[PDB]
Amino acid sequence: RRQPPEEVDVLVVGAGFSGLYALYRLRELGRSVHVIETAGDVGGVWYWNRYPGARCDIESIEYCYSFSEEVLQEWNWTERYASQPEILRYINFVADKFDLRSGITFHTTVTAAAFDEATNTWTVDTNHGDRIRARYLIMASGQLSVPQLPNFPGLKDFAGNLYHTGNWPHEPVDFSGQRVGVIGTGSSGIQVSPQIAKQAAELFVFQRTPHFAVPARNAPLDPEFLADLKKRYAEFREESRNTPGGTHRYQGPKSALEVSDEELVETLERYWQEGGPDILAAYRDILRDRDANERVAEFIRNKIRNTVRDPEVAERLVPKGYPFGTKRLILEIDYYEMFNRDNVHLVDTLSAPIETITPRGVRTSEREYELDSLVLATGFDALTGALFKIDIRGVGNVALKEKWAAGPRTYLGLSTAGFPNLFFIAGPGSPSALSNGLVSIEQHVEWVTDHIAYMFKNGLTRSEAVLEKEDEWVEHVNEIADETLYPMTASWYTGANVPGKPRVFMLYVGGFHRYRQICDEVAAKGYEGFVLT
Amino acid sequence: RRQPPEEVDVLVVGAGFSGLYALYRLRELGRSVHVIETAGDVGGVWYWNRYPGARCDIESIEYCYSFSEEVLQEWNWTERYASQPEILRYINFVADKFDLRSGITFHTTVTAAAFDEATNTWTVDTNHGDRIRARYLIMASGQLSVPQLPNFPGLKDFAGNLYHTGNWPHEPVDFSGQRVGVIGTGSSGIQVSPQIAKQAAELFVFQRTPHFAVPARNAPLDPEFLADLKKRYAEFREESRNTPGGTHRYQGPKSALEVSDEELVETLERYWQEGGPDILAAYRDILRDRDANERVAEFIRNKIRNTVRDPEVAERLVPKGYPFGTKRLILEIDYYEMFNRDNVHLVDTLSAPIETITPRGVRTSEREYELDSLVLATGFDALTGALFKIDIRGVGNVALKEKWAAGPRTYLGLSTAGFPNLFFIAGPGSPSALSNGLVSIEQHVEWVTDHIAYMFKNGLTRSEAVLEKEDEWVEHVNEIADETLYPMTASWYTGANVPGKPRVFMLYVGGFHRYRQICDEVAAKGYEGFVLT
């Protein structure tokens, strides 16, 4: 409804944390710049993923922008880990303060883009038939999206109230008096279920694969601590930029294999009581050594058995057969304790898979469960899912989707050869999802917008990764992943392992500070490994 | 070039073992019937997969047709496990004997099919613009196909001779005097490499994931044994139909967890010396128990260490971290022994991934390898890959591809609700690939063609799976797989595991004889769970 321009220096796709700061920084650099966004307003995942209990897994004081001193001083975070509604208020504040919505077209989806060698510009199409010409195209389209899979058979026949964590109602849902089922126990399930358990007459949790989760120990943020922080906030964030994960997480010196059982328990118990994801770096080899991971995993398995009263239920909740911490660590608030309530029932759908959703509830091989309400607590698509929905055509009319079918091929995760003037923010080939996202997002946005300012300053109009450096980068990302446990998790690859065909690991796991040094050296040498004309 | 008919009772897609016997049996039942095949002649995988060393992993006397007494008496198998060229001669003989090519259109690919409720017929299109109307559609399109993945970067710049195991030249390739590289050590790599090692000046084997393989102990077939067999061949094959795997494999009574190390070694060593895949049923829980698999796996790991002289090379060849025998067991002929030759070199591409194919050879992170010839020893697509290349549209114009995106949904693996008059031979939801394929193929073809004869006999024209029985079957297949180790192998699922979304295991693992009883009871009760009109 705000009409997009016919021509612009830079077109940004997406208005979450990434896209908003791209828009802002490009305005400040003196460029013309516009955003296209599917949703009705700003916030990205914090706008669309609004189920009760949705909460960030990184501390509030770390998971924020640092580019504006006034923002840092004006915003008052209220809790140790911020809720989705509070994050969304923060993002809306940033957008209101800097008048960013004047540069955004909402309710609009980019459907295709192709590059014109004659003009060195992209022509971009949308689902309202807009056609936009942009010199540069910035994909701020995110890592998480709705999976592209049919639902459980029979879902549409359910006769009660049906809710999706991925599209939760805007007004609050009261489950008082109700028999409620939750299907899925990844991130959304673990976060939403204890909130539902507070209200429901009965809650059935349908679990397929059990996931690891550790206690949040969420707490109000001491105002006095926040005031001290604000006096040195800039020094604090420059410390965060100088770590492997983009936060103040203590780095664990010892091997988990070298301590006595006694020392291990004493160390891991301190982390369990403190809460949060810092336990991932309790020891140095948790993600490097099969035996060392299994040790830390076993302690967490025992905490689950200690918490849940019924030993048979406890054992069903115990994750088995796959490594700990090779995905972002889920923080839980009374999720294990929940199973001690008399009105909460775990249904193990590995023993008895779901046969069908029925008008009455859920049928497995053992029995029907009658429900008044059903909640689908869905997981997420592959990290490349959003991008693959757009028909992106580069040199030779080649589809990005075809080129990246064995895994995303990029130079520094920022650009791909054959697709000039196209940049990816916090996506594949970079630290992205395995680090404090806001630290990664700001580093990318600064690098890409500074690069784009350099082009205009030097009279250049086309920027493209060199094919050889892209091949070297992909190989380098594989080589360092192959020294870790991350490759045991199939979901970091696109498609199955096939002899005689390449396979690309999704992300750079060498550490944020290392990655940043690499990018800074590339920029300082005049964009070594890009071809600028 | 033989023109396909305008209208037929049954159209068969594919002219391998499955399609040829469908064609034959439908002719004998008095129906009109025609085949469409991409290749220039018969044989399916035995026609297109023709690299040196390609060989069946099931004994010759078991891996053959049994529907013709004259075929059984006339054919003389020469070896314990038959080579691809010998299998292809057998299939060409069957086709020559029964004049089957008069019913086949070669060089032609089916591209789309849609169902017409008004006529109860399929209309099928091909890539030569043929349009065929068929009452019934039989997919004999196979389990193995070319993977849909980009090649290694730089492959097209290789300046030497480039060979693909999936499309090997028709005239013999002489590697004498040459430096040769093989990339891929699944089935094709393990079979082709020792043949190349006999001729090459130097051979580099580029291994990513090491696979398990056991010795074939191939040997000529004693003519006197074959003569005795032929006098009771019918009794012998009825014994084969009465087993879990469709062969005479001894079924192992004991747990691998209950014997002394001593008894284990003595038992497994006898199997190692006898050769072949019967070791899979040495004990009863090899595929049921994590600890019991790991025990049998460790013995095989030690055989590898015993065979290969250089302990460092041996350890790189040792498969680690995934279970033994959850895929079809590869039989090797001097593959481990090959690494003891002075002209054979293993390159571990987990430590040093391939960066690029170069005009000279292969570059990894450590070094370039100069080669005169490069062989890509490719793996295979998902089992659903062939079917997904055809635009199949059922009731409501729904795409089979969309319906099966979380995994193939079928009743008995034969048919899917919403796609009437369509049958799958030896595909998902049945024993198919985890059993002697010829036993499975003949059971399916007999069941489907008898079903089709019943329809015509009773004046019926539309056959469709009942949605409820399809849901029950899918659930049943998941439930019995979930009691085994098969689900640890990601490749039996289509796409990643996603919370809140269904996941279907590809195959029925309950045993061939059990599956056959199920199908026979369904037919005996008038096709219970199909809707016939």
Ligand SMILES: Cc1cc2nc3c(=O)[nH]c(=O)nc-3n(C[C@H](O)[C@H](O)[C@H](O)COP(=O)(O)OP(=O)(O)OC[C@H]3O[C@@H](n4cnc5c(N)ncnc54)[C@H](O)[C@@H]3O)c2cc1C
């Ligand atoms: C419950 C939960 C907990 C989390 N915890 C953490 C944590 O502890 N640490 C961490 O780093 N991250 C966490 N995250 C992740 C969060 O995704 C990232 O930190 C960050 O918010 C990503 O922002 P973005 O702007 O890059 O992408 P997004 O927020 O995904 O925004 C992308 C936007 O692009 C739009 N878009 C996509 N395609 C198109 C198109 N074709 N046309 C128009 N618009 C399009 C989408 O609609 C969306 O609004 C969590 C996320 C959730 C849901």
Ligand SMILES: Cc1cc2nc3c(=O)[nH]c(=O)nc-3n(C[C@H](O)[C@H](O)[C@H](O)COP(=O)(O)OP(=O)(O)OC[C@H]3O[C@@H](n4cnc5c(N)ncnc54)[C@H](O)[C@@H]3O)c2cc1C
């Ligand atoms: C090296 C090797 C070893 C093997 N060892 C064993 C073993 O030990 N045991 C076992 O059971 N199996 C084994 N097999 C597997 C073998 O695939 C099956 O046993 C059997 O041959 C399958 O026959 P089919 O007729 O169903 O399919 P296929 O032989 O795959 O024939 C399908 C045909 O359909 C054609 N087709 C596909 N789509 C279309 C279309 N759109 N239009 C026209 N034509 C189309 C293809 O071109 C192909 O010719 C092995 C295979 C190989 C390659």
